[PDB]
Amino acid sequence: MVLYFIGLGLYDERDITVKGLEIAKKCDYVFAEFYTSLMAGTTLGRIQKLIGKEIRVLSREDVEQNFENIVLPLAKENDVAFLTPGDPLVATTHAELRIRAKRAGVESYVIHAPSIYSAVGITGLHIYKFGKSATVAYPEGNWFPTSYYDVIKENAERGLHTLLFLDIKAEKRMYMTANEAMELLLKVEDMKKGGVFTDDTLVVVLARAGSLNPTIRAGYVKDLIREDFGDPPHILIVPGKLHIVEAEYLVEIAGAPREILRVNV
Amino acid sequence: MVLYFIGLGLYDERDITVKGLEIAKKCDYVFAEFYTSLMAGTTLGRIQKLIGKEIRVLSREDVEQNFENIVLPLAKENDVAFLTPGDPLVATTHAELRIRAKRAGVESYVIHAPSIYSAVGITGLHIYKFGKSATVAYPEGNWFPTSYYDVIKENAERGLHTLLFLDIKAEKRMYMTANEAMELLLKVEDMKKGGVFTDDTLVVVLARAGSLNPTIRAGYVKDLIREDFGDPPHILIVPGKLHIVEAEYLVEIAGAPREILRVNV
Ligand SMILES: Nc1ncnc2c1ncn2[C@@H]1O[C@H](CSCC[C@H](N)C(=O)O)[C@@H](O)[C@H]1O
Ligand SMILES: [Cl-]
């Protein structure tokens, strides 16, 4: 009669919360999805080993179209767990699943876990200064989406930071790198000439957040566009005007050039 | 030899990640602060029991003025952890403490935990639509803070949601309620008259996020301003223009007036 939405956290199998683990262990059935994002620092096997349960992976179609047929039925007479990377409900489509549960007469509860949305605080940038978020999508065919560029412009215009999620082909396990994202943005700039993203733009790269050894780098596009930030996942941030304390953290912790202390503050 | 910043999560001791727990259990010394936020579902004792170490609580002054005199000295010869509610680097000035660690020759690592900043996803409002965040501070003496009002205005004109952290006086054991936050906003509205926050404004209240049964309520200020949302901590949200699916969730899950379903495109 109960369905638990449980977050797996940022990077590996230990990023789930103690509450999440214990509840998942007591569940009769455990499902999971790995299409909204991936858990780069672990494997399905390692997660299964930790939970001590068989985990049935569901595709986007399984969830978006058949959640009420695959998961909810068992949730009616048993304790069921639905695992997702990060924090449950951050992915725009997950919240709606609770409405499906309600209509099927199933109670649902949410067990949170660290999300990249909050983990970016490790960049030294003030969380309250982050504006609207956006996703950089790979162009393809005659389709060249560029809305994420406008999001940066509107945020930066108001002195706000822009968190950019990078595209991911979950099934194919292909990760968009910060480098590729910078190239795309430069390409978009060259097309809109809005003076939003150029070689002189200051950016921050956060790679493998959640890991004990994440890569935190800050610098101008011209110097970072071809830098190796390590293995994915990568997240790109275009900060707005910086508070001196943010700048000093980027210099001292993220190896940013001293120049930011006078050019971006 | 090392200093760890470890988040404890939203509500109780079990909101700490497995990673944070395993690492804390092995540290030689464990310090913590409980003034940046309120964990309403546990106690120092329960945390100490779970971690299996005595936890020395530090005050805001101990941290802000003597972190390098109380904590860092031990980190040079031992494994030390600094515990905080939620995520250690979200809506706090703890990031700067890493700079102090560096300058003191102490390597530091960060272990994330669930943060209110992303837990708001449980309100059903899309995370990416949240703009700049702000804090509703208690008026004191002749000083009456009003900046949070402008943040709402700026976000709303852009169709963005506004997350409002509510003030806290840990030592005086005072936790601002959503009701008090609303009262203050109505006053600032009278003062500035920007049509930003009135009795007809739709708002969302999230209380005790992290618990299995947090209070999630949506409605017009005139109707919620006197409603009892239970014990603290509380968070207040002023939505911007809603997507139909967001309104859907607010109605079905947070009991919002069914009229908000009729979104004005
Ligand atoms: N479980 C919870 N429910 C509602 N609000 C919460 C909350 N935990 C924190 N807050 C809000 O955040 C304020 C502290 S701000 C510090 C937040 C912390 N670093 C985090 O990551 O959550 C509180 O006064 C309250 O308004
Ligand atoms: Cl500011």
Swiss-Prot record, chains A, B:
It catalyses: 2-[(3S)-amino-3-carboxypropyl]-L-histidyl-[translation elongation factor 2] + 3 S-adenosyl-L-methionine = diphthine-[translation elongation factor 2] + 3 S-adenosyl-L-homocysteine + 3 H(+). Its EC number is 2.1.1.98. Keywords: Methyltransferase, S-adenosyl-L-methionine, Transferase. One of its GO terms (biological process) is methylation. CDD domains: DHP5_DphB (cd11647). This is Diphthine synthase. It is an enzyme of class 2 (transferase). S-adenosyl-L-methionine binds at L10, D87, V90, S115, I116, L166, A209, H234. Coiled coil: none annotated. It comes from Pyrococcus horikoshii (strain ATCC 700860 / DSM 12428 / JCM 9974 / NBRC 100139 / OT-3). Pathway: Protein modification; peptidyl-diphthamide biosynthesis. S-adenosyl-L-methionine-dependent methyltransferase that catalyzes the trimethylation of the amino group of the modified target histidine residue in translation elongation factor 2 (EF-2), to form an intermediate called diphthine. The three successive methylation reactions represent the second step of diphthamide biosynthesis. One of its GO terms (molecular function) is diphthine synthase activity. Belongs to the diphthine synthase family. The diphthine intermediate is not stable in vitro and readily eliminates the trimethylamino group. It is not known whether the elimination reaction also occurs physiologically. Homodimer.
